[PDB]
Symmetry: C7
């Protein structure tokens, strides 16, 4: 009543699948030999490890005047007596953050998939090297998950900033609402810079982790 | 009060039941030999592993202009406030993202077929769990691990249907805020970001399809001997 | 510190109680020999395992035009309910009602079959607990369907309220459509989970029947 | 650092205290020999185990027309039928809480002095107290759940008045009533089944519940 | 330096007196205060009562304190505009019967926290130096403190719950005024009062039963609570 | 590279060592004097010898002077305000005293080694209780803001519904709750000081030298 | 399936990578030998351990009168403390200032938190880079390394949350001030503003102590376990 072999029946698909496992290995090795070290230097050029404290995580280049509450005393924000514009400077920086996050997820996802495809058949005993594989997969997914949540967090920034702006329009002299907008912008600005450092450091620990344990990641058994 | 057989009494049902267990095994084997490999190539053809970094998870092909706030019902009164049927009424038009709609429809298709295929492979293994015994059940642990990984992918795809309703609800809510507060520019940026978020989530969903289909296939292929006969 | 035996004092009650334990066992065996297998085949006929992928969990047979935004007062804002989904939801509740009755009595019978607590040689009693737990999970799972149905109508009503207030904000109308499409899928997934739960319970009891009845 | 016995000082209270321990034991035994079997047959007569599937948990006896939404004012009445059925539930739950609490307390009063080893029978006692407390807490939550029904039904009814043509709000009232109707009957079955498993559990492990050592 | 006895000798004595005074109060509670309260609460909810004679609602006034479809005597049952804000003159009385019963509940809870609190503290102060092994009696001490703390914390939450009753009753009563056509809002007030009435009585039983299981627990394991080693 | 991490600046090394000396000084001073003084102090406010119900009562609570008045305002409970200020003082001094005793024990955990570190568990047990009481006192500042915010909300409802009496009963019950909560806090102060002191005193030998 | 070495192909990249690992070690050692002890004494100078009880966590230096409701910029100067109709919507000209004293103190907190995040991240990364190749057995010292990394991340996340709490302060103060404008008859709303400011003043000072204590607890942890943190094998 049964056959118990599950090789793909279509021989053309069987080759395309095997070509796929080859192509991943290329991308995985390629990321480790070229892409990732270059990205380490890239983010380091943005947040140099040798910087003195407070020279990275500061708020001095943050424009606190161009994008605050304004009064007016084929169109735009001119038919209204008071508007509250968005922080274009933070917008431009957030756009860069998403690019760093996308390219990270692509790179990490294929390296993680490659290690998963290298996990051997489950057996009893002598699978200490498999734990190393699992630790690497775990750390890769953790970094990947962290970058994935950035896209949703950015929508929350605009939604939260907009809510406060409505309150500023209703209570334009209650100053704590305006300080809240400023503080929201300053917080997002700091979070952006901490994200960039996390990029730099994550690429480094992931590269260092895989490099040290490369022999067990590839051949986890004898 | 001491009978110890519970085979179905109806011989027609006994036949229909046994045929059902056969059909499961049949469909499960077919999914592994053809349906899954075909989809591995399919999704890879959509998000190729050989793509250059940033060429998959980008937003360059997302129309960010055709479906933003503009300045059909109630054709006589455009962009106005009405009092109709004793209630307040906004004849302000804010369109949906026709581009995202078409992509979201395809996602549900990928999710539907995944639940059907993965669920049956999971069901087949579950129905293949042996009688509970003490000891010598290491192979049962392999069965449980496979069922867990199969169930995780299945549940992840199942959550997509509910999440899509939230996209339209969330997009609709913010658009109301743009209509009430055209001065708060962040409400317009929030709509813009929401579409960008959904566009990225769509593409990451497709990659997860590709990768889940392969690791599940690769996992089952490697442990196939213990998944079928966990004790002999 | 007086007398320490507790058989029911009224002898007529003792008979009705013993009769009750007989009536459960009959119903429990009957559920395993006929009621559950008959229902497994029924739900499979609704979501057949032999269907091509996507032909089960789809939305092709869902009417998406008859019940969208278009008598009691001299009104203009009328928004009907999805009569097609209503009929399917009514069928779901019967499936859930019949499940709780069938599974609950099988569970009670197994509970009544747990022996006196003793130390050791109770591996089969652990099997009994697994069966009772799995039966209770399926019972609890089906039980929550009634509340989920109330939420569907409530959620559809709120969105429909939003469509009346913002008749040109198109995403509110998409949200109604997607809500109905979601329920249509959930209805079918509910039927699959019914089918799969009944058989996994049946397969579980069948394989371990000896330890379920005589764990010692 | 003075005196190390804590027997009650008042001899009249000491007598009343022991009488209470006697009265508990009496009530508990009476509950197991008469009160619980009597209710098992009682609840079974309301939800007979021999009923065909769906004949218990149905909605056929639920009035779905008398209590729906009605110059012209418009009111929304309560489901007087569900009111009537919910009142009985609170009666069933109250009598259960009274009965189980004293049986649970009696076993608690029968838990021995803590010793090392040979306290396997105490585990039987603990298991029994756990199940009694579980059933008691389950019945206790019914009073708060009933207030939510009226609160929830009132909320939806407000929406029907505000949006009298959005029919899903009217379906929500109907569905809520059908949900409460089903929950009522599931509660009655849970009563029957709880009384039986509690009685069956105590009967089987009676020797260790009374003499754990 | 490695000794930390108090430098002030008057303080050092007062501290020893306090440990003595606690031991005094705890024993008094076990010998007199607790048994008296066991009988007291039992006289309120006698164990010999037939089922339903305790947890019923027959003695609850459900008619005197419902909304009748005093300040601002000129405009009765009306909506006003004062200081540019909305004003409702509508009168809705409080449930005076439940108020009197709740006041007693707070008294029972206050006396419980004081009595149970000192017994718990006394046992805690009797925990020996932490050592490895031969600490089976310390587990008994820990078990007693846990049950003592559970009863104490349970009673402590009653003060907060009583505020919620008045807040919830007022909220629903507000809805009855806004929606006199929604009959379920009127049913909700009734059920809330019936719920509080039942909860009050179950609280009284829990007082009775907690006093007994606590007294029985300490008496049976008294030897290990004082000399766990 | 190089494998020493003594502070490079010789001036900092002295300033740092003086700090660790000052910590030990303050912690011992707290255990020998500050804490026992607090035990007697709080006991004199909630005497253990009090008859039941004489502590946790509401008899001394002014419940009429600060109710809804008559154009209509709603005043604050000045009596509770004065008692809340004292509560904050007790909590501040507690955090300061307990924090240094906790910090000193944390600074006294030895170098990590494998096995024969039963005494380190005692240190951890002591730190856990010290932090628990400190965290409990820390939340008092936030809880006080909630009192006024909650009281103001109810008073807002009383102004909107001046004849719905349950809203007025809610104000009264809130004040009575805060009055009781204040006193339970003082007892918890008294009891925590003793349980911490008694715990440290009994296990003092292992708290200081957990390994010999 | 070919070669299983993944050294960077460009020798130039290997130099910047190796230079980077050296530059971290420099920064980490510099932080442990100089930066952190300096910070310990600094925060101690703000909340001195030798202070008598209640002299630190008090409210005596808090201006609670200058900024309550009767460097900002008053708007709608023609209509003061009134309701207006602007862009067909509701508007309250009412002026309610911020607490400049709390503002200045919060600005200092953010610098303390930023410099902490910068310092801790490099020490943590350095230890992460110093965790050896995974091997079976003799990895008791790696547990020390992991424990050290764990505590470093806890402190780093703790400081990170200060920025959001500061946004919450202003939002909370603004809402209550809104209530004071609507209900000047409810005296408890005015007390809530006062208590909110008093709460933040205390939280500011407790934050500074938590800084001080975390810097020393991290330094004390690394100093005592230095041999196993660097060479666990």
């Amino acid at each position: 009543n049964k056959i118990d072999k599950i090789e793909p029946s279509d021989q053309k698909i069987k080759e395309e699948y095997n070509k796929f496992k080859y192509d991943i290995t290329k991308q995985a090795i390629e990321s480790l030999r070229e892409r990732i070290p270059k990205r380490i230097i890239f983010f380091n050029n943005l947040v140099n490890v040798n910087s003195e404290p407070g020279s990275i995580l500061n708020v001095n280049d943050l424009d606190g005047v161009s994008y605050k509450y304004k009064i007016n005393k084929i169109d735009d924000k001119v038919l209204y007596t008071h508007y509250v514009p968005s922080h274009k400077q933070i917008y431009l920086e957030l756009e860069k953050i998403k690019t760093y996050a996308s390219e990270l997820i692509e790179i990490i996802g294929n390296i993680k998939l490659w290690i998963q495809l290298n996990v051997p058949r489950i057996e009893d005993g002598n699978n200490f090297g498999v734990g190393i594989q699992e630790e690497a997969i775990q750390e890769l997914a953790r970094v990947e998950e962290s970058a994935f949540n950035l896209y949703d967090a950015i929508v929350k920034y605009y939604m939260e900033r907009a809510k406060i702006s409505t309150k500023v329009l209703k209570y334009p002299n209650v100053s704590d609402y305006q300080e809240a907008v400023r503080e929201l912008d300053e917080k997002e600005w700091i979070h952006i810079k901490i994200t960039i450092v996390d990029m730099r450091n994550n690429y480094i620990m992931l590269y260092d982790l895989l490099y040290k344990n490369w022999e067990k990641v590839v051949k986890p058994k004898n």
